Design an enzyme around this catalytic site. Sequence first.
Site, short mmCIF file in Angstrom:
data_model
loop_
_atom_site.label_atom_id
_atom_site.label_comp_id
_atom_site.label_asym_id
_atom_site.label_seq_id
_atom_site.Cartn_x
_atom_site.Cartn_y
_atom_site.Cartn_z
N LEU A 1 -5.44 -0.07 -7.49
CA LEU A 1 -5.09 -1.18 -6.61
C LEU A 1 -5.34 -0.84 -5.14
CD1 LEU A 1 -1.64 -1.97 -8.33
CD2 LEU A 1 -3.69 -3.39 -8.60
N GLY A 2 -5.07 0.42 -4.77
CA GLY A 2 -5.26 0.86 -3.40
C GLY A 2 -5.88 2.25 -3.30
N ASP B 1 6.74 0.71 10.07
CA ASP B 1 5.31 0.44 9.98
C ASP B 1 5.04 -0.95 9.43
OD1 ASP B 1 2.32 2.11 8.61
OD2 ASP B 1 2.65 1.04 10.49
N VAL C 1 -2.85 4.18 -5.64
CA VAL C 1 -1.94 3.34 -6.41
C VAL C 1 -2.68 2.64 -7.54
CG1 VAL C 1 -0.36 1.38 -6.35
CG2 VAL C 1 -0.45 2.96 -4.42
N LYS D 1 2.30 4.95 -7.64
CA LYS D 1 1.79 5.66 -6.49
C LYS D 1 1.63 7.11 -6.91
CE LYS D 1 2.98 5.79 -1.54
NZ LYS D 1 3.47 4.41 -1.20
N1 LIG Z 1 -2.89 -3.53 0.49
C1 LIG Z 1 -1.87 -2.47 0.52
C2 LIG Z 1 -1.42 -2.03 -0.90
C3 LIG Z 1 -1.60 -2.94 -2.13
N2 LIG Z 1 -0.96 -2.27 -3.29
C4 LIG Z 1 -0.13 -2.93 -4.20
C5 LIG Z 1 -0.51 -4.10 -4.83
BR1 LIG Z 1 -2.18 -4.89 -4.48
C6 LIG Z 1 0.35 -4.71 -5.73
N3 LIG Z 1 1.53 -4.19 -6.01
C7 LIG Z 1 1.92 -3.06 -5.42
N4 LIG Z 1 3.03 -2.35 -5.52
N5 LIG Z 1 2.96 -1.37 -4.78
C8 LIG Z 1 1.79 -1.35 -4.14
C9 LIG Z 1 1.11 -2.41 -4.52
C10 LIG Z 1 -1.18 -0.82 -3.45
C11 LIG Z 1 -1.29 -0.11 -2.11
O1 LIG Z 1 -2.12 -0.85 -1.23
#
Ligand SMILES: NC[C@H]1CN(c2c(Br)cnc3[nH]ncc23)CCO1
Length: 247
Positions: free
Chosen positions: A9-10, A108, A11, A26
């Site tokens: 997703l990024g 942040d 995680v 994470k």
């Molecule tokens: N755009 C910043 C985030 C988007 N992210 C998520 C997303 Br997309 C959906 N659910 C989440 N839960 N924790 C983080 C997260 C992962 C980390 O990056």
Amino acid sequence: EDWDLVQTLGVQLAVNRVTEEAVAVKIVDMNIKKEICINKMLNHENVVKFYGHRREIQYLFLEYCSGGELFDRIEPDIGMPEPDAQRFFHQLMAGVVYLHGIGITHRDIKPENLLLDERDNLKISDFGLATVFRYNNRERLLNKMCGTLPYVAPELLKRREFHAEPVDVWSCGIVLTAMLAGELPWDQPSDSCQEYSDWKEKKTYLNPWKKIDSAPLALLHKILVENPSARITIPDIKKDRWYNKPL
Ligand SMILES: NC[C@H]1CN(c2c(Br)cnc3[nH]ncc23)CCO1
């Protein structure tokens, strides 16, 4: 029980083998101890839920937000419809009131850390930089510099110590500016910055303030106040006129 790591997703997005529930994981290989500590105290509908952690490299099990991040709802240079902006800001304020309520500052706040669930509910996310600013009912001033330059309050750049709460408030105003105009007003709130100088001089016939309605702009005039002691507080934001406007 077994979780499948569907995608990054990024995680990573994780889905339960039996129930098919979705969560976010994470993955950090060795700040983190405190992130977990803080997450353990958090229970709110406008904050990303903490499920748990495993010390294998460390795994944090966090609520999954299928909505994505708030930045993907902002059309660059345009923003978003004012009614959606307000709703998100209402929820952002609910989230922040809660955190400050239990003595925690995010430090942040920015659209990259504001996520949306399936009903478009906003969730404050990533407490990696968060810290405790009130314990046993005693406030501790901050001295460490944290955050992201365009969203950071001016006192964090010129003062050796500062109150945590007004810092988060300033960042929420920057986020509100972004939701209504699609752009950030300055690179940083420093006097070497022409754009911040123009604002301090009330030149709101330039962007991004030209694109904002007078009612939401009056609230920004109260939030983006350089003196953290004169800056509006959250309880008074909640009494602001645009804040209580039916939209
Ligand atoms: N755009 C910043 C985030 C988007 N992210 C998520 C997303 Br997309 C959906 N659910 C989440 N839960 N924790 C983080 C997260 C992962 C980390 O990056």
